[PDB]
Symmetry: D2
Subunit: 485 residues, 4 copies
Amino acid sequence: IMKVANYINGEFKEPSTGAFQVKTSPVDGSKIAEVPRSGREDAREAIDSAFEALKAWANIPAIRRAEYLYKMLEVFRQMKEDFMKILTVEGGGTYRKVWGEVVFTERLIQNAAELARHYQGRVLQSDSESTISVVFKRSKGVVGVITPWNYPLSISMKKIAHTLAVGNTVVYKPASDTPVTGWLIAQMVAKAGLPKGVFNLVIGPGPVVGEEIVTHKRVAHVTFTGESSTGREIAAKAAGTLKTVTLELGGSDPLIILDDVDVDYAARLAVFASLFHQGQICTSAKRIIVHKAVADKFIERYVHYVKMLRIDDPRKDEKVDLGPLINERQVALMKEFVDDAVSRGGRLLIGGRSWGNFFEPAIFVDVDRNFRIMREEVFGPVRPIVVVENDDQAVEVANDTDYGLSGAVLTNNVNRAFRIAEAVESGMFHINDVTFLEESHVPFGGIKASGVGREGGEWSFHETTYDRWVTVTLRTRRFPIPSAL
Amino acid sequence: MKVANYINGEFKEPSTGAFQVKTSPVDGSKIAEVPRSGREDAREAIDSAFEALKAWANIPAIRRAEYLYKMLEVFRQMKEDFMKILTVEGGGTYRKVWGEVVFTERLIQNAAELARHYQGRVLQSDSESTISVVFKRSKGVVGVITPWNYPLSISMKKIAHTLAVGNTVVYKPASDTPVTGWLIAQMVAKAGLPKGVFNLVIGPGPVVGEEIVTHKRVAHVTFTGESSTGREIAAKAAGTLKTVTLELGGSDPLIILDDVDVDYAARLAVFASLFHQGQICTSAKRIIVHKAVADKFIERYVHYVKMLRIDDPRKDEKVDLGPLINERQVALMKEFVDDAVSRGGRLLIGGRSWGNFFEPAIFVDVDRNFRIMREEVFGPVRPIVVVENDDQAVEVANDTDYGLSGAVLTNNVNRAFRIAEAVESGMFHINDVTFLEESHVPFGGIKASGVGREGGEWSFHETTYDRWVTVTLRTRRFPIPSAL
Amino acid sequence: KVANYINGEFKEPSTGAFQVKTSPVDGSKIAEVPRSGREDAREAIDSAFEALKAWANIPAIRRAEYLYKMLEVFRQMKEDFMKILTVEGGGTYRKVWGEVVFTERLIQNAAELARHYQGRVLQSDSESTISVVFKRSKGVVGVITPWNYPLSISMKKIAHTLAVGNTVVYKPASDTPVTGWLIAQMVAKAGLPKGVFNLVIGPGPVVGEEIVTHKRVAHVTFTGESSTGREIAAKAAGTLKTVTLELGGSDPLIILDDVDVDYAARLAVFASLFHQGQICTSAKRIIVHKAVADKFIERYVHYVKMLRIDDPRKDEKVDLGPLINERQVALMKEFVDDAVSRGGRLLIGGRSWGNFFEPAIFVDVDRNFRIMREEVFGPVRPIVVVENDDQAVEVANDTDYGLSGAVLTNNVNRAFRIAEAVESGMFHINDVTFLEESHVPFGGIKASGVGREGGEWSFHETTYDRWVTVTLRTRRFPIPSALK
Amino acid sequence: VANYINGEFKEPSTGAFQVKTSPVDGSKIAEVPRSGREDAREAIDSAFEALKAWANIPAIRRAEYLYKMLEVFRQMKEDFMKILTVEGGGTYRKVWGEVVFTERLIQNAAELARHYQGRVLQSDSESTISVVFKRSKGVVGVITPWNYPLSISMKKIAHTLAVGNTVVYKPASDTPVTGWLIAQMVAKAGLPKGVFNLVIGPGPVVGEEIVTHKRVAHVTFTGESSTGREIAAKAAGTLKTVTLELGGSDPLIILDDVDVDYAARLAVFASLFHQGQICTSAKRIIVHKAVADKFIERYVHYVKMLRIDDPRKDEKVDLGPLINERQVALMKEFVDDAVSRGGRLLIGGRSWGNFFEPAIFVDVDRNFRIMREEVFGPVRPIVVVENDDQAVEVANDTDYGLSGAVLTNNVNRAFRIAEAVESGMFHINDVTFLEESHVPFGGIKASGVGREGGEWSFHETTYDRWVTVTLRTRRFPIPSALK
C-alpha cells in the first residue's frame, strides 16, 4: 500500500531524477520493492534541510529532545513485527537474529532518550583570581550517518538516536542492500513527529550520495560503519572541510581458549560466537585459537555442534540457525577464502558447499599466518582454528592481525585471563563470553585497522559534541603593554 | 652554535650531514647551525619511539609522573636559557618570553600532577553476572608538530601531557624555531627519560613532518599551525587511520559594548590585539565596537597604540613589540595593508616597516570583503568595525571561517551571556582578553580553527583510547544450534 | 479505605487504631487513616530488609523498568493526586498542578538515571594491580517527609532511592497521609516486588523514631524542621546510619537598584508567598537597595493586595489557600504580634479567619525581630532596606539558615560577587529562590541541613563506594625478616 | 613539646603537662601538654578567622604550600622514623613504610588541589544556565589514633587543607610527639597563621570541645567504634558532618587451589604486621578444609620465625611491643576467653612488659570473643570451612565491614566471594591492608561512614553548590488576575 521513498524535510518523496531500482531478497531472489536511486541533488537538499533545522533543534532544552525520542520508542514498539519481517526477507536474518536486533534497537532508542538530559560539562578551578571558568557541551551540527547491511537496524539506530539526543540533526544513507530497513526507520521518525529537517533519509549509491555527505561543507561530522577501505576513503575526503569522523571498520577478533576450560561449553560458545548471522558480524569470533592440551577435544566438539546447524529459508520457522549471505558477491568471496585455504595446505574439517546466496560454515585447521582467512576480515562463515602451545603464543597469534576490534578468552584462571586481556591489542575484550557482546551504553569501537572513536551512550555523545570553555573575569587588571603606562 | 637531533637517547647529526644556518629576525645575525634531516632520520626516531613504547606505557603512572617532576626541576634551572633563545630566535620581548616560560613551568607541572589521576569507568551491566569496566590506554607513538610563535609553551603542552599518559613522542619543531626544540631535548635528556621515549627531529615539514604523518607506527599526530597545513595533515593521516588534534589559528572577535569603561576597554584591546605583534592564534584580530562608544574607543585605542615601543627586544625589559619572525610575514602584512587601502579603508596609524619590524597598522571604514576581515591576520594589522546593536555585533563576529576564541566587554549580565552563547567559537571570555589560557582547560576551536582540545585531561583524552572489558561469571545457553 | 502498605499488602495497623484526617479548608472529614505503632514499623522494616538482596542484585535496567511502570501508573492518577493535594494539603489548583507535573518529572528522572550511575577505574601506584571502585546500595532506607509539598518531596526521595537498589520504609507527615497512601496505590499498581516499598502511616515520635533507631535501617532521608532533624541525627548515631537532612531556610531575595522594579515586585510576590509561603526555599527575607526601595515597596504591596484568598477547591484561579492547620495560624499570629510590638510597620494584611491567613508585610524591622531570626513558614514577610551591596550581603547572611537565595540585578559583577558571598547551598541570579529541577543538587548549609538530593546526588546519598583490587603478581613480605 | 595555635608554638593556658614514656622500656620521652577547653577554643577561633583567606586564594596557591610541606617532610624523614619507633613501638620496617606512604600522601593532596571539579548541567528550562560549584566546608576537626599516627593524620590533614578548609588537629594521647613533629613541618612550610592548629590533650576534653563547637564544620575521626558513635551523636547538636573510620575484623579467605606456602607467608604479614595493630589487619583467617592442615602448619612455622625485640636495636626486628599495658591486658582477656571456650592454642601467648608473642588459635566457633570483637593486637583465630558458601557466611558474621581478601586462582570463585563479602574494600590475592593515597578508604556496618583518600577526602570536606542564571523574564502564576 506504500511506495518506498526518501524522507527529506518532513516529507516522503521520489528522488529528483525519478530514478529507481529493484530490491530483491537474498533468500530466493524475489522482488521486495522498488527503491529510490538518489543522486547528489537529493543529498544536498537533505543536508540543507538538516542545516536549516539545526539551530531550533539544538536550542530547545534537552528534555524536549528526550520527549521526541520517547515518542520514537513508543512508535518503534508498535512497529516491531514490521522491522523483524524486513530484516529477515531483505537482510536474510533468522528469526532469532532479527528478534535480537529489534530488542536491542528498543534498548538503544530508550538509552539515547534516558541520557539526553544528563550529558554534563565541568566547572574548573581557575589559576587566576576573580575568574569563573566552566566548560559547556555543544552539538557539532549536521551529522551524516552511513551504515552497513548486516545489522542495519541496530547499527543505524545506535547512531541516529544518540546523535539526535544531544542536539545534532541527521542525514542518513542506509546500505544499498538494506534500503527498506532505512525507509521503515524514516516511517518511525515521521510518526513520532520530529520537527521537519531534523532527520532525513536519502536512499542511493554510496559513491554518489555518501560522497556528497562526506564532502559537503555544511556537514560537521560523519559516523560510518563499514569496510576499512571505505573508511580510509571517507576519512581522507572528510579532511577537505575538517569534519570529524567516527569509524567502525570491522574486525578479525580472536577467541582464545585455554586448557582449563569446560571444553564442551567452550565449543558451544565458540560456535555461537563464530557463526551467528553466518559470521557477518564485525565482532564475530573470526580466528579461533586453542591451547594444544584441549585442542583435539575442542575441535571434535566444535565440529560436532557445527554439524547440527540448520541452514534454511529464514522465513520458514523460528528455529532456523543460519540464513543466506546478503548477495552473490559474498558467496564468491567466501569461495575464494575456502579455495585459498585448501590450496595452502589447510585441512577442511567440515562444510564448503553453497547454493544461491547460501554458504555453509567451513572450518579449517592446519593453517598458517599467510592464509587469507588469517590475514583478512572474513565476513562470512569461514573459520580457522589455530592450535598454540602456550599463552605467549596465543597472544602472539591473537595480535597478528591488522584489526583490533574485540576479542575474548575462555579460562577459569584469574591470572591468565587478566594477563591475556591486557596483552591482546583490541578496543574491547571479554573474559568468558562471546566476542560480540554489546550493550547500549558502553564504548563500542576498535583500534588499529578497526577504526577510530567509540559509540554507545555517552561515548556517542562525546563523538558528536564539542567542549566549549567559557570564562568570566570579575576584576580589572593592568596590562603589560604599553609598558610606558 | 651547533644543534643536533635527539634520537633514542643520543644527540646526533642527520644521517646525510646536511645542515643549514639560522639567523635572528632581529638583525640577521647568525644564531646556529641546525640539521636538515630527511625521511631516514624521521623513521629512526619513529622506530625508537615504537620500540620504547611498551616499557613506557606499562610502568605505573606514578613513575611517569616522577620523570615529569624531574623534567620540571630541570626546566626551572633552564629558564634563563629558554628566555634568551625565545627572544633572539623568535623575536619575543622580555615580557612575552617571561610569560611563556612561566606558563611552560605550569604546563609541565600540570602534566605531572594529572598522570596518576586519569580515570576509566565502572559501568552498570544490563546482563546478570557481568562485570563491565572501561580502561584508559595510551594510543602509542605520537607525532608532535609545532609552530614558531610560542614554540616553547605550545610544544611543552603537547609533549608533557602526551608523555604523562604513557605515549612516546616524535617531535618536529617549526623550521624558524629549531633551537627552542633542541633546548627542549636538552631538558628531557637531563631529566633522564628512558631512551626512545622522547625524540627530536629537525627538518623540513614536507619531508620530516610528512614522514611522521604517514608512517604506520605513528598512532596520533597533534599539530598546531596553519589551517591549510592542518587540512593536508588530516588527509594524509587517513591512510593509516591515525587520529589527529589540530589547532589551526583564528580570527577572534573582541566585542565592546556601550556600557563599558571605554579607556579600560581600549587598554585591554591593545594588549589582546597586538601582544607579540599579533602573532597569536587567539589574538583579538577583529575588533567590534558599539556605535555609542565607537568614537571615544577608537581615539583611546589609537592613543595607546601610539605609545607602544617597538625595538630590539634584546635591549631591555620594557620593549613592547619586537620584529615579525621573517620577511615573508612582513610581505604578507604589506599585502593586507595594500588591500585595505585599495578597498577604501582609513589607515589611522602605522604601516611603517623596516627589516622584520612593523608598526601596527590600524584600519577603520572596513567591510566584510577586506582581506583583514576574511583571513587570519597573524601579525600587527587590525580592523575596527562599528556596529549599531548586539545583533549586528554577533553577525559580524560570526562572519568568519574561523572559530577559535572570542570575548565581550560589558557590565550587563544578559548581554554578556547572550553574546557568549551566540558567538561560534571553541572558547569565549567575558570581560577579559581573547587569548586567556590555563594549563588544564580545554583549548581549541571549531569551524576552520581545527578539531580536538588540549590542556590537562583534555590532552589525555586526545592521546588515549577507551577500552571496554567484561567478565561474565555465569554460563548460559546459546541460540544456535537450535537442535540443542 | 486508607491503610498501610507492608510486604505487598494493604492492611490495618496491628492495634486497629485509627484517626480522622480533616481538611484545612473547613475541617471536613477526608478519611479515617491508620495510627500505626512500632510493631507496624518493625514489620515494614523487616519486609524491606528481606526484600533487599533480590532488589539490589537484579540489573539496574530491571529497576528502571519498574520505575517506568510507576511513571505510567502516576500519569493515570494525576487528577486523583491533585484532588488530594488540594483538599488534604490546602494547595491551590496552580500549586498542586505544579507539584504533580514536577512529580512526573522526578519519577522519570530516577528511571532515566538508574542504569548510568558509574564507579571508577583507577591508576594503581603498584605494578600488576587492577584497581576499581564499585557503587553499592546502602540497604533499607527510611523516608520521612513533610506536609507542604508532600507528593514531590516524597517521590524525589522514594523514586531515586529505589532506583539504585535500596528498599524503602516510608512515613508521610501526619497532616498529609492520603497522599502517602495514594503513592502506595501507585507503587502497588506498578507491581514492585513485595517488601521493596512499604508505607506506614503514624506518629513521627513513634513510627518515625522506630525507623530512625532500628538496626536494619541503613539510611534515613528526612525533610522537616531543623529541631526534628537535629534529634534524628542524634538518634541515628546509635547504629551509625547515615542521614540526608533538608531542614528549611530563611532565604534572602536581594534586589539591587538597577532592576526593572515592577518585574522585581512581581517576582518577589511569587517567590515570597506562593503556597502561602509554606516552602523551605520561600523568599522569606526581602532585601532591597535604598535607591529603588520606595517604588519596590509600593509595587510589591500593590500585587500582594491583588492576591485572591479562597477555598482552593472553588476554581483554578485561586491564588492562596489556607495554612495546613490552626497551629500554623497561631504561630503566624505570634510573628505578626512580635513585629508590631517591636515597632515594625505593618504595610498590609495580618488578619486571619479559620485556617486562612492574610499575607502580612513589614518594613522598618531590625535583626531582633522573630521574623528575621526564625524560619517563617507562612505568609509573614519582612522587607529590609540597605544602602549598598555590602549591607545586602551582611543582612542576607545574618541568619542561622543557608538553603537558597537570589539576587535581582542586570550587572554581571554585582550578581557574581553577591552570589559568591551569600552563604547558601543554592543560589539563583534573576529568578525566584525556590527554583528546583529533578536532577540538580538540592540542599543547604548551616542550619538548613546536610547532603543533597536530586538525580545522581540522591544516588550519592544512598550508595557507598567500594574499592576492589586484583593483584596479579606474587611478592616477598617484610616479616619474617629472617626469611629468604 | 607544645601546642601550635595561630602560627605560634605555645604551652597550654594552664601550663599543665604530662610525661610520656616509651612503650619499649618505660623510659621518659618528653613532657607534653595537657590542654583544656580554652586551648581547643583558641585553636578553633584561629582556624575560623583564617578560613576565608585560605578558602579564597586560587587552588594553585594552596597546592604550592603543600608542595613546600612535601619538601620539609622529605628533610624530616629520619626524625619521624625515630619517633614512630620510640614513641609508637613501630619497627624500622613499619615506620619506614609509614614515612614513605606519608610522603606520597602529601604529594597526592598537592597534585589534586587544582583539579577538583564541579559540573555544568542541562537545564529543563529555557534560557537558564545551571552549574554546580565545589566549596570547602570550613573549619575541620582532625582526631586520630596511635597505631599509624603519621600517615593517618597526614592523609586527613593534607587533603583537607588542599581544598580550602582550615584544621584543628588533636593527636592520640599515646602519640603526641608525632603530632608535634607534624606541626613543626607545617610551621617550616610557612602556612598562614591559623590555617593549621595543633592541640595536645585528652579526647574527653579537647576532642569533645572540637566535636561540639559551633564554628567547626566537620570532624574526620579514626579510632574505636564506641568513640565514633559518641562523636557522631555529639556532632548532631550543631549539624556538623563527620567522616568515621572505626576499625575492622577483616576476613582473609584462603581457598583450596592456592600456593599454600605463599598463602601462609601472606597471611602472617597480613595478620601480624605491627603486632596486628592495624584497622585492616587480617583479623579472622578462614581456610578451605582441603588445604587447612598444611596451611595451619606453614602459618605456625612462619609465626615461630618472627623476631620480637626492641625495635630500636636494628632494622630486622619483625615485631615490637604493644602501645601500652592496657593493650596487653586486653590481649590476655582474648586468650583467656578462647582457652575457656575450647580453643587450641597452637603457639604464643607469652607476654613481658608491653611485648606479646602472637597467640594463634584453632578449634574456634562464632561465640569466641576473638570472632565477635575487633582484636587490635596479635591474637588470631584460624577457622576451617567446607566450601565457598561457608567461607562467605563466616566472613560476614561480624558487626564490622572494613576490608577483606580472598586467595584463589579461580576467577569465578574470586569474584563471587568478592561480591558476596560485606565490606567497604576488598582485595583479590593480596593482603587485607592494601592502601593507596588516592583510593576510597573506608568501611560499612560498624566500621564507619565516609571515604578518605584523594578526591574522596575532598568529597568529605566540601559541599556542592547549585547556582543558576536566568536570562529571560517570565509571567508568574500569582496574582492570577494579572494579564
